[PDB]
Structure 1
């Protein structure tokens, strides 16, 4: 239940259809900042 008095936290709360814990805003943050084995450069 999201009866938060009208406040909408859906953009900061976890998104179940996201990388398993990350909200929309965390996804935006993680997309605005930029094991190599031995056979990946061989």
Structure 2
């Protein structure tokens, strides 16, 4: 049996399998992606994030 696609891949920096990477890529996280720490919203442009 072959489990190379559900076992973790150490070449990735986050220890996630290929199918988990696909499942993370399909969902657009949209808001609350990474962190909106303060200082980042102190800089402003014409189009502002929700």
**1:19 Cα deviation after fit:** 3.2
**Could you report, residue by residue, the CA deviation over 1:4-42 in whole angstroms, capped at 9, with x for unpaired residues?**
xxx110011000111332000000000000131221119
Q: TM-score, normalised by structure 2?
A: 0.60
Consecutive aligned runs of 4 or more in structure 1 exceeding 4 Å deviation: none
Please report the RMSD computed on the Cα atoms of aligned residues, expressed in angstroms: 2.4
Aligned equivalents of 1:19 and 1:29: distance in 2?
17
Q: Quote the residue 1:10 is aligned against.
A: 4
Q: Which blocks of at least 5 consecutive residues in structure 2 are unaligned?
A: 29-34, 42-49
Aligned length: 36
Q: TM-score, normalised by structure 1?
A: 0.69
